[PDB]
Amino acid sequence: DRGVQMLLTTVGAFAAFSLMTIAVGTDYWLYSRGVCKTEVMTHSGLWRTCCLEGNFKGLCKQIDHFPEDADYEADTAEYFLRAVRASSIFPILSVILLFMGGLCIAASEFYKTRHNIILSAGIFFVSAGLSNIIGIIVYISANAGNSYSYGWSFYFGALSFIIAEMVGVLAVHMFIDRHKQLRATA
């Protein structure tokens, strides 16, 4: 039905937005060995690395995205990838697109005669999923330069992509149904 479809789309949009904003915010993306001051088990996210054992437990440190090395063998591609990873532009872009899609879905209730808003919300959700994919690939590639594990923050973002794709599909379905009903009367 239309009502359950709308409720499911709204709930899924809110869930995806909350999961993505938790993933960007918290710092449990990666469970890897390292240091948290200036080789122990630490947990790191997009911005901070914190130890979880020893005398340095609970201490967080901002990630050194451009470590002080010689940097006379690196090319422009490495700098570009490192800048993209450090800015985390794609996770934040996905968050912004999810928020805008949710706003479009909410605004369509007050503007029920405007059917392009549902299409815009669907496009926003699909684009947010694509941005999430790009951000995940960038993060994994930047971590490439020996056991490591991904935490729940990483999988919270992964679950946000799947929900956003599902909510995007539902929004496009409503756009199809709305336009099919218009020609049914005509």
Binding site: G129, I133, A158, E165, V169, H179
Partner: protein, 146 residues
Amino acid sequence: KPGVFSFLDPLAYEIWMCIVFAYIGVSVVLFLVSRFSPYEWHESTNEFGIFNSLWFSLGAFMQQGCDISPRSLSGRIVGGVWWFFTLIIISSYTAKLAAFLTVTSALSLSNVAGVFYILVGGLGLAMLVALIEFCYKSRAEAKRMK
């Protein structure tokens, strides 16, 4: 010591996750560009729903034929870029598998028992789904006939 799922060794686990995510995204985008426009409706000019889009993407990745192929410009862009991705990924997997297996003895059943288990589990799941849908349809028809 090779595992039951040792056929997944040639590619990293992150590659498999990103392959699944790419498949989902490609299917969703293909359905969106095929069906969103009210100007290709009448009944749709194509059978590229979300279910059929997922089927097409799986068939393309699995090196298998399909009953349908996109005809619009954007659907064909999606299909072509997916075909390029599939060609590169499958060629890389085949090369890495040749590297992994040649590290001469005939391949033993212990190395493919995982794929056999997956196949039988899929057959069981399909039979269960068919039985469930048959039961639901039979209940609906019985209610209707009353």
